[PDB]
């Protein structure tokens, strides 16, 4: 089997991407944030504290003939941006772009943090990291991909995120029309439960490539590119007026600037992030100070190849017995 679904930026900055998911019988379609940095599929629901719902579409298990309460199971998650959610668990039928899983754990939110309430466009998350990170207790549950894997034509999914435009998540096949040149594959460590890999270095604009190992995660659920302070300093030093602002919480730059590209290495191959992808617009409405798309990972504890990086590539998440990651230009 295979699946193919379009993923759509939530706003004009590509702050996140939503993908429609069918849950239950008859189908209830929710728009979920596909997140290769976590492993819980959770949804706003009929059980969510009413004051914490503000415009989201909810899953109502009582209206689904295939929903079953997973007795005794609870979940609770905290994300790197300080947001959180928790609740109980159902199993139900979940379909993505024509690919169907029966008995998928659907984690129903009783509580969500303010960040989630305030984002009316995101109805929940669909985790695509390794199932070892799943928070369901006392019986850990599998991700959608993990459940689908054996049925897929090939044990892979691909992320093809757009810049200011829709893109695609495919399950079970590689669309050879969706990228240019070749896919370069690179090793993955699953030891922390993430799609963790090592970039071979970087370049800033038309500058020379610096060969250096940068361990990080391929994370579709994080907006920006978070790299070591040395790398990030080297980038922003090429933008007149750019500075790190403690009050804003990162590097800012004059909105009048033309940003240089940033290149990262995948083995001997190179992915180029155009300068425009690194512009996240005014820090506040009407400001001429703009927020940068490349930020320091110092004090995150891990480097994160988020959407800014991933949207410059066609990315293969290979879930073979020994997982790997593939990157192609597009």
Coordinates of C-alpha atoms in Angstrom, one line a residue:
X1 CA 0.0 0.0 0.0
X2 CA 0.9 3.7 -0.3
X3 CA -0.5 7.0 0.9
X4 CA 0.0 10.6 -0.4
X5 CA -1.3 13.7 1.3
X6 CA -0.7 17.4 0.7
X7 CA 0.7 19.5 3.5
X8 CA -0.1 23.2 3.7
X9 CA 1.6 26.0 5.6
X10 CA -0.5 27.4 8.4
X11 CA 0.4 31.0 7.7
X12 CA 2.5 33.3 5.4
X13 CA 5.7 32.6 7.3
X14 CA 5.5 28.7 7.1
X15 CA 5.5 28.6 10.9
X16 CA 4.2 25.0 10.6
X17 CA 2.4 22.7 8.1
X18 CA -0.9 20.9 8.4
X19 CA -2.0 17.7 6.7
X20 CA -5.5 16.4 6.6
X21 CA -6.1 13.1 8.5
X22 CA -9.2 11.0 8.5
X23 CA -10.1 9.6 12.0
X24 CA -12.9 7.2 12.8
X25 CA -16.1 5.9 11.1
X26 CA -17.6 7.9 9.5
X27 CA -14.4 9.9 8.9
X28 CA -13.7 12.9 11.0
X29 CA -11.1 15.0 9.2
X30 CA -8.6 16.9 11.4
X31 CA -5.7 19.0 10.2
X32 CA -2.6 17.6 12.0
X33 CA 1.0 18.8 12.3
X34 CA 3.2 15.9 11.1
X35 CA 6.1 15.9 13.5
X36 CA 9.2 13.8 12.8
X37 CA 10.5 15.0 16.2
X38 CA 7.9 13.3 18.4
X39 CA 5.9 10.1 18.5
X40 CA 2.4 10.8 19.8
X41 CA -0.7 11.2 17.6
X42 CA -2.9 13.5 19.6
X43 CA -6.0 15.5 18.8
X44 CA -8.2 18.2 20.1
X45 CA -11.4 16.4 21.1
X46 CA -14.8 16.4 22.7
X47 CA -12.9 15.8 26.0
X48 CA -10.7 18.8 25.8
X49 CA -11.3 21.5 28.5
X50 CA -13.8 23.8 26.7
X51 CA -11.9 27.0 27.6
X52 CA -8.8 25.6 25.9
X53 CA -10.5 25.1 22.5
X54 CA -10.6 28.1 20.2
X55 CA -11.5 27.3 16.7
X56 CA -9.9 23.9 16.3
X57 CA -11.8 21.0 14.8
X58 CA -12.3 18.3 17.4
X59 CA -12.4 14.5 17.3
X60 CA -15.6 13.1 19.0
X61 CA -14.9 9.4 19.7
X62 CA -18.6 8.8 20.7
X63 CA -19.6 9.5 17.1
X64 CA -17.1 6.9 15.7
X65 CA -18.4 3.4 15.5
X66 CA -14.8 2.0 15.3
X67 CA -13.5 4.0 18.4
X68 CA -12.6 2.0 21.5
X69 CA -11.3 3.4 24.7
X70 CA -7.9 2.0 25.5
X71 CA -8.7 1.2 29.1
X72 CA -6.4 2.8 31.7
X73 CA -4.2 4.5 29.2
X74 CA -3.1 8.1 29.6
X75 CA -0.5 10.3 27.9
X76 CA 1.3 13.5 28.7
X77 CA 3.9 15.3 26.5
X78 CA 6.1 18.4 26.7
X79 CA 7.7 19.8 23.6
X80 CA 11.0 21.7 23.1
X81 CA 9.2 25.0 22.8
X82 CA 7.7 24.6 26.3
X83 CA 4.2 23.6 25.1
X84 CA 2.3 20.6 26.5
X85 CA -0.8 18.5 26.3
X86 CA -2.2 15.4 28.0
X87 CA -5.3 13.2 28.1
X88 CA -6.6 9.6 27.5
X89 CA -6.4 7.2 24.6
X90 CA -8.7 5.6 22.0
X91 CA -7.9 3.2 19.3
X92 CA -9.6 4.0 15.9
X93 CA -9.1 3.9 12.2
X94 CA -6.8 6.5 10.9
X95 CA -6.1 7.3 7.2
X96 CA -3.6 9.6 5.6
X97 CA -3.8 10.3 1.9
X98 CA -5.5 6.9 1.2
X99 CA -3.3 4.8 3.5
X100 CA -5.3 3.3 6.3
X101 CA -4.3 1.9 9.7
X102 CA -6.8 0.1 11.9
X103 CA -6.3 0.2 15.7
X104 CA -4.1 3.3 15.7
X105 CA -3.7 4.9 19.1
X106 CA -5.5 8.3 19.0
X107 CA -4.6 10.3 22.0
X108 CA -7.5 12.5 23.0
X109 CA -6.5 15.8 24.7
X110 CA -8.1 16.7 28.0
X111 CA -5.7 19.5 28.5
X112 CA -3.6 21.6 26.1
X113 CA -1.2 24.5 26.8
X114 CA -1.9 28.1 25.7
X115 CA 0.3 27.8 22.6
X116 CA -2.0 25.1 21.2
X117 CA -5.3 26.9 22.1
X118 CA -4.0 30.0 20.4
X119 CA -3.3 28.3 17.2
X120 CA -6.7 27.7 15.6
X121 CA -5.2 26.0 12.5
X122 CA -3.7 23.0 14.2
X123 CA -6.1 20.3 15.4
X124 CA -3.3 18.0 16.8
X125 CA 0.0 16.3 16.1
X126 CA 0.9 13.2 14.2
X127 CA 4.3 11.9 15.4
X128 CA 6.7 10.3 13.0
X129 CA 9.8 9.9 15.2
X130 CA 10.6 6.5 16.7
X131 CA 7.9 4.8 18.8
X132 CA 10.3 4.5 21.8
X133 CA 9.4 8.2 22.5
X134 CA 5.7 7.6 22.6
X135 CA 4.3 8.8 26.0
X136 CA 1.3 6.5 26.5
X137 CA 1.3 4.8 29.8
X138 CA 1.2 2.1 31.1
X139 CA 1.4 0.5 27.6
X140 CA 3.5 2.5 25.1
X141 CA 1.8 2.8 21.7
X142 CA 3.2 2.8 18.1
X143 CA 3.3 5.7 15.6
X144 CA 1.1 5.7 12.5
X145 CA 4.2 4.9 10.4
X146 CA 5.2 2.1 12.7
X147 CA 1.8 0.5 12.4
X148 CA 1.6 1.0 8.6
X149 CA 5.2 -0.1 7.8
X150 CA 4.7 -3.8 7.1
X151 CA 1.9 -3.0 4.7
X152 CA 3.7 -0.4 2.7
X153 CA 5.3 -1.1 -0.7
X154 CA 8.6 0.1 0.8
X155 CA 9.1 1.0 4.5
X156 CA 9.6 4.7 3.9
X157 CA 7.9 8.0 4.1
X158 CA 9.0 11.3 2.4
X159 CA 8.7 14.9 3.4
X160 CA 8.5 17.5 0.5
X161 CA 7.8 20.8 2.3
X162 CA 7.1 23.9 0.3
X163 CA 8.4 27.4 0.6
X164 CA 5.4 29.6 1.0
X165 CA 3.5 26.9 -0.9
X166 CA 1.9 23.5 -0.3
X167 CA 4.0 20.3 -0.4
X168 CA 3.6 16.5 0.1
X169 CA 4.0 13.7 2.6
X170 CA 4.2 10.3 0.9
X171 CA 4.1 6.9 2.6
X172 CA 5.5 3.7 1.1
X173 CA 7.1 5.1 -2.1
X174 CA 9.7 7.5 -3.5
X175 CA 8.3 9.9 -6.1
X176 CA 11.2 10.1 -8.5
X177 CA 9.6 13.1 -10.3
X178 CA 9.7 15.2 -7.0
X179 CA 13.5 15.9 -6.9
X180 CA 16.4 16.7 -9.0
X181 CA 19.7 14.7 -9.3
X182 CA 20.3 11.9 -6.8
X183 CA 19.2 11.2 -3.3
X184 CA 22.2 11.0 -0.9
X185 CA 21.6 8.7 2.0
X186 CA 23.2 9.2 5.4
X187 CA 23.4 7.2 8.7
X188 CA 20.8 7.6 11.5
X189 CA 21.1 7.0 15.2
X190 CA 17.9 6.0 16.9
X191 CA 19.5 6.1 20.3
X192 CA 17.5 9.3 21.4
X193 CA 14.4 8.2 19.5
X194 CA 14.9 10.8 16.8
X195 CA 15.9 10.8 13.1
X196 CA 19.4 11.8 14.2
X197 CA 22.2 12.2 11.6
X198 CA 25.5 14.0 11.1
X199 CA 25.8 16.8 8.5
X200 CA 29.3 17.1 6.9
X201 CA 29.5 20.9 7.1
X202 CA 28.2 24.2 5.9
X203 CA 28.7 27.3 3.7
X204 CA 27.4 30.8 4.0
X205 CA 26.3 32.4 0.7
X206 CA 29.0 32.0 -1.9
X207 CA 31.7 31.3 0.7
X208 CA 33.9 28.2 0.9
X209 CA 32.5 25.0 2.4
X210 CA 33.6 24.3 6.0
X211 CA 34.0 20.6 6.6
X212 CA 32.8 19.8 10.1
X213 CA 30.5 17.2 11.7
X214 CA 27.2 18.6 12.9
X215 CA 25.0 16.1 14.7
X216 CA 21.3 17.0 14.6
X217 CA 17.8 15.8 14.1
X218 CA 15.5 16.0 11.1
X219 CA 12.4 17.6 12.6
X220 CA 9.4 18.6 10.6
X221 CA 7.7 19.8 13.8
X222 CA 10.3 22.6 14.4
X223 CA 10.1 25.8 12.3
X224 CA 13.6 27.0 12.3
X225 CA 17.2 25.7 11.8
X226 CA 19.0 25.5 15.1
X227 CA 22.8 25.0 14.8
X228 CA 25.9 25.6 17.0
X229 CA 26.7 29.2 18.0
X230 CA 29.8 29.2 16.0
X231 CA 28.0 28.3 12.7
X232 CA 25.1 30.7 13.4
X233 CA 27.5 33.6 14.2
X234 CA 29.3 33.0 11.0
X235 CA 26.0 33.2 9.1
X236 CA 24.7 36.4 10.7
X237 CA 28.1 38.1 10.4
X238 CA 27.4 38.3 6.7
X239 CA 24.2 40.4 7.2
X240 CA 24.8 44.1 7.9
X241 CA 23.1 45.1 11.1
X242 CA 22.2 41.6 12.3
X243 CA 22.6 41.0 16.0
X244 CA 21.6 38.5 18.7
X245 CA 18.9 40.1 20.9
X246 CA 18.3 38.6 24.3
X247 CA 15.0 40.6 24.6
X248 CA 13.7 39.2 21.4
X249 CA 15.1 35.7 21.9
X250 CA 17.5 35.3 19.0
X251 CA 19.1 36.8 16.0
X252 CA 17.3 39.7 14.3
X253 CA 18.2 41.6 11.2
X254 CA 17.2 44.7 9.4
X255 CA 14.1 43.9 7.3
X256 CA 15.7 45.8 4.5
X257 CA 18.5 43.2 4.2
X258 CA 19.1 40.7 1.4
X259 CA 19.9 37.4 3.2
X260 CA 22.6 35.1 1.9
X261 CA 21.9 31.5 1.3
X262 CA 23.0 28.7 3.7
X263 CA 24.4 25.4 2.5
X264 CA 24.5 22.2 4.6
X265 CA 26.4 19.0 3.7
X266 CA 24.9 15.5 3.4
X267 CA 27.8 13.3 2.8
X268 CA 29.5 14.7 -0.3
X269 CA 26.3 16.4 -1.4
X270 CA 25.1 19.9 -0.7
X271 CA 21.6 21.3 0.1
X272 CA 21.2 25.0 -0.5
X273 CA 18.7 27.0 1.6
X274 CA 18.0 30.2 -0.3
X275 CA 18.3 33.4 1.7
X276 CA 14.6 34.1 1.5
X277 CA 13.8 30.9 3.4
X278 CA 15.7 32.4 6.4
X279 CA 13.4 35.5 6.7
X280 CA 10.7 35.2 9.3
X281 CA 9.5 38.7 9.1
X282 CA 8.9 41.6 11.6
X283 CA 9.5 40.7 15.2
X284 CA 6.2 42.6 15.9
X285 CA 3.7 44.1 13.6
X286 CA 5.1 47.1 11.8
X287 CA 8.7 46.6 13.0
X288 CA 11.6 47.0 10.7
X289 CA 13.5 44.4 12.8
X290 CA 13.0 40.9 11.3
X291 CA 13.5 37.5 13.0
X292 CA 16.1 35.1 11.6
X293 CA 15.4 31.6 10.5
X294 CA 18.8 30.3 11.6
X295 CA 19.2 30.4 15.4
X296 CA 21.6 29.0 18.0
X297 CA 21.0 25.6 19.5
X298 CA 23.1 26.5 22.5
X299 CA 21.1 25.4 25.6
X300 CA 18.7 23.3 23.5
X301 CA 21.1 20.5 23.9
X302 CA 20.7 19.3 20.3
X303 CA 21.0 20.7 16.8
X304 CA 17.7 20.8 14.9
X305 CA 17.3 20.6 11.1
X306 CA 13.8 22.1 11.2
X307 CA 11.5 23.2 8.4
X308 CA 13.9 26.0 7.2
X309 CA 16.4 23.3 6.3
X310 CA 14.0 20.5 5.3
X311 CA 11.9 22.6 2.9
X312 CA 15.0 23.1 0.8
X313 CA 15.1 19.3 0.2
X314 CA 13.3 16.2 -0.7
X315 CA 13.7 14.1 2.4
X316 CA 13.5 10.3 2.7
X317 CA 12.8 8.9 6.1
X318 CA 13.9 5.3 5.5
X319 CA 12.4 2.9 8.1
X320 CA 14.3 -0.2 7.0
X321 CA 15.7 -2.5 9.7
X322 CA 18.6 -0.1 9.9
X323 CA 17.0 3.3 9.4
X324 CA 18.7 6.0 7.2
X325 CA 17.9 9.5 5.9
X326 CA 18.0 10.6 2.3
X327 CA 18.3 14.1 1.0
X328 CA 17.9 15.4 -2.6
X329 CA 17.8 18.9 -4.1
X330 CA 14.5 19.8 -5.8

